[PDB]
C-alpha cells in the first residue's frame, strides 16, 4: 500500500473532516546564551 494518502478536503465536509492549519512552537532549553525575548519597556524618565 502507498504510505501517503490524499486528504481530499472539501468545504461541504464536516467540522472533523474540515482542513485545519496547525503551528507548533518549540522552545529550546537554556544551553546557549539567550537570543529571544519579549518586548518589555514602558515609563518615562522623571528626573529630580
Amino acid at each position: 500500500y502507498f504510505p501517503l494518502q490524499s486528504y481530499g478536503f472539501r468545504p461541504t465536509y464536516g467540522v472533523g473532516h474540515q482542513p485545519y492549519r496547525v503551528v507548533v512552537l518549540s522552545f529550546e532549553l537554556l544551553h546557549a546564551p539567550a537570543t529571544v525575548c519579549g518586548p518589555k519597556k514602558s515609563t518615562n524618565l522623571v528626573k529630580n
Binding site: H31, A32, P33, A34, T35
Partner: protein, 48 residues
C-alpha cells in the same frame, strides 16, 4: 568567555617604522552570543 565572543579593537597611526613605544587602551567593538568551542584560528589573505 562563558559562551560570548568578544572583539576589542583600536586603530593607531604609526609614528615611526614598526611597533612604537606607547600606551593606548583597546575599546570593545563587538560582542557575539555564539556559545561554541574555539581552539584554533587563522588569518585570511588575498591576491590581486
Amino acid at each position: 568567555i562563558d559562551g560570548y565572543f568578544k572583539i576589542y579593537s583600536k586603530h593607531t597611526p604609526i609614528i615611526g617604522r614598526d611597533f612604537p613605544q606607547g600606551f593606548s587602551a583597546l575599546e570593545p567593538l563587538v560582542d557575539l552570543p555564539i556559545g561554541i568551542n574555539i581552539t584554533r584560528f587563522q588569518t585570511l589573505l588575498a591576491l590581486n
